[model samples]
Target: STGSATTTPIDSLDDAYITPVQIGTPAQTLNLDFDTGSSDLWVFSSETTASEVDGQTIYTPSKSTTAKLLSGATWSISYGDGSSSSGDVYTDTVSVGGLTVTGQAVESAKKVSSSFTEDSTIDGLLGLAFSTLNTVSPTQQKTFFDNAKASLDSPVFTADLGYHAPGTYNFGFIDTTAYTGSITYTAVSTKQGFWEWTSTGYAVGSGTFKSTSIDGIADTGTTLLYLPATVVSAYWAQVSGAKSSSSVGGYVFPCSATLPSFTFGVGSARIVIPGDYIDFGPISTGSSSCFGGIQSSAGIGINIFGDVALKAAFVVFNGATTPTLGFASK
Candidate 1:
């Protein structure tokens, strides 16, 4: 099965987003944004003194009245966007959907930047993508899945995106009905939580744009697909008169156009990305023009298939049994 990634700009609150899941005894309910970009679970805390923490949902272990702290461990994280937060480690009874797992590791923030603290809507982030890129140390930290695996009905867990609607992040056993065929499993490498793969080539509609080939990682934390400039330009050229627009940081085209679809040839599987994804949002300069799916990441050697690509499939992260990503259809 194809492992899924998390989408940013969650809830239009910028960084303020949360993935709805149950935690603690009697389940002290909470919603955390599932982030694949970074590996860390940091929640707003009552101890947080930053002004950004106001109005944001704080995970007060003391409020749960049943949570436990991890003695002396401290945690801090800084994102690519320049926002940062720091706090102490704690454990609690965590639950997602019907599955409840106790003694789960979580972070309680004492300080956060204005960018993170001001976003009152977002409570915390659940790093479900890959463990390799985790910012926290295993000797001092453990993820939600790490502790919950034994209690899960299946040793596997799937994340189903519900589009831009509420209750979109569904976690649990793989739902067979979501896909059109059998799930494809790729064994996770020993390198942390990253799922590595080599791409044979990329396709847009019936066109084979490049044979140069490329290999890299897929991250849910990123919003756009980052590829070499040549590949990005080649893919956008097929969009029928699509032109580069500076406002959107990529090519722009009319959404109504019969845009050619594209797929990445990964091993024996040809993963197709839908047309809507190719044209994600409105062009920054032109309200009516939408941005193209591909973008230029000329200097960045690694290519990341982000959320726009993930929305089209059902992704499973099977870290419990053996690190593996199962991809199926939704």
Candidate 2:
């Protein structure tokens, strides 16, 4: 989500994982994450303490034909979810699809938790979301797309996502064949470094709001959508006979029957998030109620439409031609 427009999930590389396209002539295998929330590419290094990094791939700088360190710059990041990691800067010749980018700056983590190490299938994370949150200094920071944008045959990049299936995600020049016609584009706001929108308000199955709207940012790095508590509670109220269970953190709900459909207006675009997306499994709180994908993040101060919301439609980020986002359907 940070450097590239496409949002790629950070999951296993086994049967259930999405296959990534290889870059470079010899093909250096690198895992990419759809992280619109932060700008950084970090990999476990061979020097990482073995106990801390048991199952993850540690990039061997010696093995990489083209690799170099950033020299003296250090970086660390902590997410709102409480997970954090730190490392030094480095550069390497990286490639995605057929595009090869030289001097790509990345991080090599010296300390990581079992969450990162035990995940044997997850090699590393590639930040492709936006530039605002980039940890790399302006003089040293260069996005994965920034280098390839000039050489790429097309000025656009598209993401195709599928769950529990190979070939679920892909990145490259935009595939014209996937679209029905001309791609519909939205201009990006500079403030948030994300696709922002305003919702007058919401209703459960059906509701209405004034044209005066609020702002929301699309974040791929995040696993769940975070909206204002008032907005989330109002939408949940629409569930017929829906009740909240304490077993799950207050965000989950239980319903007797099927839930209703709700819509949010992004300017003139009315995007509907179906009921099925709301039906998440019971939470750690032990409540049998199904959790809605939407959660309250008023405490955090920004509204996020995460992967659950993004997976519903086709999304494109055209960084080269014009800094605009394109949304469509397969």
Candidate 3:
């Protein structure tokens, strides 16, 4: 079986991407962030507090005859950005695009952070990463991807994230038309329950490629591209007035600054991110200072090849026994 879903950039800055998901017997449609960084299929539900409920849709398990509570099971997940959610577990029929999974563990949110409440564009998150990272207690549940992989035509999913536009996420098979050039494969290490891989090196603009192995995870949940401070500094230095401002919290520069494109290596392949993508947009409304999409991964434990980097290329998450990641120009 194969399935394809359209992912839309939720904000003007393309801060996050969301895809429609149908959960329950009658199908309560909710737009969820298809995050590859975490493993917990959680959602805003009828159980969530009124204070935490804003403009987002809620999943009412009682309305679905197929819903069955996983008694004593609970889940809690906290993101690097400090946002979090926790809830009880329920098994239900969940469908994404045209693919359906029966008895999928759906963590119904009982508590949520203010950040999630304010973000009305996404109702919840559907983790696409390995199920080893699942936070459910008692017994960790398999992610939707893991459960559906066995029946899929190919145990793989492809992400074609777009810049300031809609993209496609295809399951079971790769859509040849979504990408250009041959796909470059890389061995993935799921030691930490992530689609972790080593990047050959990076180059700022048309500069020489520095041959070095940089370990990082391909995270669709995160908004920006984070790399080593040395590499980040080198890239920012090339732009006039660009500085790591403590007040602004990250590297920011004049909004009109001429930004340079960034290139990173995946084995022998070099994926180039456009200069416009690096210029994240104004720090504030009508502000002349703009935040950079590329920043230092100093404080963060691991470098994150986030949406900024993923949107630049076509990414394939191959779910073989020894998982592998495939990258290609799009």
Point to the candidate with the largest lDDT: 3
Cα lDDT tens digits, model 3, 1-330, are 989999999988999999999999899999999999999999999999889999999999999999999999999999999999998999999999899999899999999999999999999999999999999999999999999999999999999999999999999998898889999999999999999999999999989999899999999999999999999999999999999999888999899888999999999999999998887888989999999999999999999999999999999999988899999999
- What candidate 2 gets wrong by more than 4 Å, as runs, is 1-28, 113-115, 118-121, 137-139, 163-172, 179-183, 195-203, 206-212, 240-247, 255-257, 285-287, 320-322
- How many residue pairs collide in each prediction? 20, 16, 0
Residue-wise C-alpha lDDT for candidate 1, range 1-330, written one tens digit per residue: 112233334653121235666555556555577766566777777777856566776676777766887787777788655788887877887666555556777787888888766666667777765544555544556566655556556666665554453324444466677677777765555463555555667777777644456655556555667777777787777767688767555678876786677777545566677765566656554477876667776655567766665655666667664666666655
- Cα lDDT, all candidates: 0.64, 0.60, 0.95
Q: After superposition, how far is residue 235 of candidate 1 from its true place, in Å?
A: 1.2
lDDT (Cα, 0-100) at 282 in candidate 1: 62
Q: What is the full ranking by TM-score, best candidate first? A: 3, 1, 2
Candidate 2 structure, TM-score to reference: 0.81
Question: Ten-residue segment with the worst summed lDDT in candidate 3?
Answer: 275-284
Provide the clash count, candidate 3: 0
* Cα lDDT of model 2 by residue, 172-260, tens digit: 55665654545556666646655554554444566665354556766655656677777777777776555554555656556445766
